[PDB]
């Protein structure tokens, strides 16, 4: 799969890229997913992970397992949007609308990825 992380922290970028790769390998999800992009915002605690699958409910369950594995533990408030591109926003605070807008922007960017 394609893995890229948008973070201003140098160590966080590489470490979470490795975490994403490992979580994909553990669930055997590498060949079933086209792209996996994660946006890290730690100053205001919230993270966004987008998934563009290749081309059922079991695959979706595996994808939410991947989100649960990758996301930091403290971010327990999560909501997801699924319209052939699964995007989830995780934060320790109730989700704000701007974060959802960023999520849909990531979703549309992932859709046109080719």
């Amino acid at each position: 799969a394609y893995i890229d992380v948008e973070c201003n922290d140098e160590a966080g970028k590489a470490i979470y890229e490795r975490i994403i790769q490992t979580s994909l390998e553990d669930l055997v999800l590498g060949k079933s997913i086209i792209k996996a992009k994660m946006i890290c915002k730690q100053d205001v605690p919230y993270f966004i992970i987008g998934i563009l699958p290749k081309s059922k409910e079991d695959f979706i369950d595996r994808v939410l397992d991947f989100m649960n594995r990758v996301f930091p533990e403290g971010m327990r408030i999560r909501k997801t949007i699924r319209d052939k591109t699964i995007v989830m926003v995780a934060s320790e605070k109730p989700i704000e609308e701007e974060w959802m807008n960023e999520a849909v922007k990531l979703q549309e960017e992932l859709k046109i990825f080719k």
Binding site: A1, I3, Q21, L24, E25, V28, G30, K31, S55
Partner: protein, 550 residues
């Protein structure tokens, strides 16, 4: 007039199938095909990322592709269309799994092993012990090591397609065995077919070993028999605990894994040097027995045409276009025999003519019936090509036309007489009549075996004589050229579909490939190829669990 191929021609061609004129050079080249555009986008991404700028796919060199309308392909008796690129054996996982399932199958009889265990080794053999042995071999065949944690074992998820199954013609033993790993002849076959197969098999017990696909991918086809034998020996000495010496163990080993072994194909000599279980060693009768449409269909034409489709996909595509030539391949020739209902229409006409004139099997094989049936079917097929210009555009190569017409003629003759050599004789007469009709035939060396055929069809000489069931890709006339062997297998099957036979050459192969645990279901090869062409076929042999995700 109503023809079975009319609907496909309506779908493929925008103009009337009887219309003699069209226009070209207005489709934009390769851009008219979604597959080619996907290939271009991929090639760009791969070149930039993995190839470090070394070009891979350049449509701008060579022929300007797409000067004409690139037609889509139906699949006979299936209502789904696909591009021609999806039917390439490398782009189609269904064809790859079709070859994988045949390659990784070995049938071993376990009656000498049981007799040696009972008498020489002094160990009792009971259905409970057989169940224990089946458990042991099912754990050990893929990669397992019995009660030895210190031994290296293959990852279990890497061999999810590996099974060990058992079947027997003994009814009481069959119902005393565990149904988890039993191929039940009674519930898989109709009553009369099951009775015939049980009578042919006898009161003997056989085990089928499906080596994992990955083993055949990494290694060759000759690895399968050795893998099966080694695992069978280990499981036999692990399940049954024996206190006899080591020499008695050698006798038991011979009895258990070197006595009643049935392989799919034989080794090939000369420049075709190959091991066993390669597609060039599979006889036509064996391939007819591999296909299981006699189980689920009473139509003789459909039974012959499924074998034709499987034989085309194996012999013409995999064997000839890769094992023997390589490159883009000979997909064209094989798809011509199973894409549209052209061969279906021709074979149905041949069956109707035979039924109206001679009866279903109402004549003994004589020269006159061969000549008249083959001539009538060939003339019908050629005039069908003549009066439907879209049909001639669909089968643009001469070979694909010749093979289809000759296959129809041979199937008709086999229907009339029930003799496979008479059917092949009709095939050859059809070929030369086609040549005189259209002043044309296949490519440069298409009719090497069609000029030599008439004399070799009923010959009795050493290197020329063989029943068509016992012939195959290593038959000297059939060794090289494309567009024959799959149709030969279909004709061999049609020789027995006329008689309503339960099998053609080997009952054990038929029962073994009736197994529901196979990845490729041989009951409907055309449907599975259609599924593979749509990227909806789950093939085995993928090393997903030992590779990085990035």
């Amino acid at each position: 007039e109503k023809r079975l191929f009319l609907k496909a021609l309506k779908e493929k061609f925008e103009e009337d199938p009887k219309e003699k004129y069209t226009k070209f050079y207005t489709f934009g080249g390769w851009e008219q095909s979604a597959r080619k555009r996907e290939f271009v986008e991929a090639n760009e991404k791969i070149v930039s990322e993995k190839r470090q700028g070394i070009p891979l796919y350049n449509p701008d060199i060579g022929v300007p592709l797409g000067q004409r309308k690139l037609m889509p392909y139906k699949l006979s008796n299936t209502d789904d269309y696909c591009e021609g690129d999806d039917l390439h054996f490398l782009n189609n996982a269904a064809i790859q799994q079709l070859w994988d399932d045949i390659r990784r199958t070995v049938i071993v009889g376990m009656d000498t092993a049981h007799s040696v265990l009972e008498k020489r080794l002094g160990v009792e053999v009971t259905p409970e012990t057989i169940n224990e042995y089946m458990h042991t071999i099912n754990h050990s065949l893929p990669g397992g090591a019995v009660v030895q944690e210190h031994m290296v074992e293959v990852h279990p998820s890497l061999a999810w397609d590996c099974y060990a199954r058992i079947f027997t013609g003994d009814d009481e033993l069959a119902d005393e065995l565990d149904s988890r790993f039993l191929i039940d002849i009674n519930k898989l076959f109709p009553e009369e077919q099951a009775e015939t197969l049980k009578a042919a098999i006898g009161k003997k017990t056989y085990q089928v070993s499906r080596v994992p696909s990955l083993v055949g991918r990494v290694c060759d086809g000759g690895t399968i028999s050795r893998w099966s034998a080694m695992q069978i020996g280990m499981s036999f000495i692990t399940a049954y605990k024996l206190c006899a010496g080591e020499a008695a163990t050698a006798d038991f080993s011979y009895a258990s894994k070197h006595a009643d072994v049935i392989q799919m194909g034989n080794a090939l000599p000369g420049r075709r040097a190959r091991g066993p279980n390669e597609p060039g060693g599979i006889r036509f009768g064996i391939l007819s027995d591999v296909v299981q449409t006699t189980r689920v269909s009473e139509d003789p034409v459909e039974q012959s045409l499924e074998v034709v489709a499987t034989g085309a996909a194996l012999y013409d595509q995999i064997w000839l276009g890769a094992y023997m030539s390589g490159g883009i391949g000979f997909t064209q020739y094989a798809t011509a025999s199973y894409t549209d209902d052209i061969l279906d229409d021709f074979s149905y006409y041949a069956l109707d003519y035979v039924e109206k004139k001679y009866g279903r099997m109402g004549t003994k094989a004589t020269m006159d019936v061969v000549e008249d049936v083959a001539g009538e079917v060939t003339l019908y097929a050629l005039e069908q090509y003549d009066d439907y210009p879209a049909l001639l555009e669909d089968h643009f190569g001469g070979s694909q036309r010749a093979a289809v017409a000759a296959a129809a003629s041979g199937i008709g003759v086999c229907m009339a007489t029930g003799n496979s050599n008479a059917g092949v004789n009709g095939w050859y007469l059809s070929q030369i009549l086609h040549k005189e009709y259209h002043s044309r035939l296949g490519f440069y060396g298409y009719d090497l075996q069609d000029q030599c055929g008439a004399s070799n069809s009923l010959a009795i000489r050493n290197d020329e004589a063989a029943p068509l069931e016992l012939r195959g890709p290593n038959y000297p006339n059939y060794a090289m050229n494309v567009g024959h062997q799959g149709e030969y297998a279909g004709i061999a099957q049609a020789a027995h579909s006329a008689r309503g036979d339960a099998f053609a050459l080997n009952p054990l192969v038929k029962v073994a490939f009736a197994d529901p645990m196979l990845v490729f279901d041989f009951s409907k090869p055309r449907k599975e190829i259609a599924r593979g062409a749509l990227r909806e076929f789950e093939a085995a042999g993928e090393r997903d669990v030992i590779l990085p995700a990035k």
